[PDB]
């Protein structure tokens, strides 16, 4: 049973488990992806590669990730753009920033992207986001347009606990965000 696990509850200046890309850095004991600055992209990856499935069996892994995040916007009206947990090839580099969350380069289906991602998008991009224009949790796969979304009320400065799980057998991804208080 190939396995991989880790728990982190105190990020530090020298926190070697992770890989920092873009403007990502670890400050105030928390993983800082971006700050209240324009046009930035901050990504952080777990150093060790994980075996998600096997060819000579066709077995797919079974996993779970749990994390607490905080989106703190100076102004609660103008918020952008989004946070994201992603699964990408072993040698991922930051992609297009801005509305493309740093993991994708276009709206079209890019088969070679090989990146699936559960996004928490706080900015309506008329070119590809749901017409209702609500902040939403979305499941992307090889493109910035979500294959499914759920409207979500961002609580400026509050910390939501997210729990994402994957069942290799039924292949159903599950995502849950919860704002305690």
């Amino acid at each position: 049973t190939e396995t991989t696990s880790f728990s982190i509850t105190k990020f530090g200046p020298d926190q070697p488990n992770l890989i920092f890309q873009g403007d990502g850095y670890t400050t105030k004991e928390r993983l800082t992806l971006t700050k209240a600055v324009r046009n930035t992209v901050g990504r952080a990856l777990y150093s060790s590669p994980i075996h998600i499935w096997d060819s000579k069996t066709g077995n797919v892994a079974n996993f779970v990730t749990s994390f607490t995040f905080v989106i703190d916007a100076p102004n609660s009206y103008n918020v952008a753009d989004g946070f994201t947990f992603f699964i990408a090839p072993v040698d991922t580099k930051p992609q297009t920033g801005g509305g493309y969350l740093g993991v994708f380069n276009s709206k079209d289906y890019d088969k070679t992207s090989q990146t699936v991602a559960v996004e928490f998008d706080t900015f309506y991009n008329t070119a590809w986001d749901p017409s209702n224009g609500d902040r939403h949790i979305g499941i992307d796969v090889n493109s910035i347009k979500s294959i499914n979304t759920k409207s979500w009320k961002l609580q400026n400065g509050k910390e939501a606990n997210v729990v994402i799980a994957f069942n290799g057998a039924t292949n159903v991804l599950t995502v849950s965000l919860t704002y305690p208080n």
Binding site: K35, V37, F67, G97, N148, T170, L177
Partner: protein, 50 residues
């Protein structure tokens, strides 16, 4: 006080390679906010026999 839940059947093997890297990503554009992860736990298990 509020909770959201979403889930879609995503056949991971056909979009992602056997070996993969995971992590977080966040960006900003004309408008912005600060995104920080205060904690992170991850566990993956995979059986090895057809």
């Amino acid at each position: 006080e509020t909770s959201y839940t979403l889930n879609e059947v995503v056949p991971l093997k056909e979009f992602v390679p056997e070996w993969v890297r995971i992590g977080f990503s966040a960006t900003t554009g004309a408008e912005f906010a600060a995104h920080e992860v205060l904690s992170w736990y991850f566990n993956s298990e995979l059986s090895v026999t057809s």
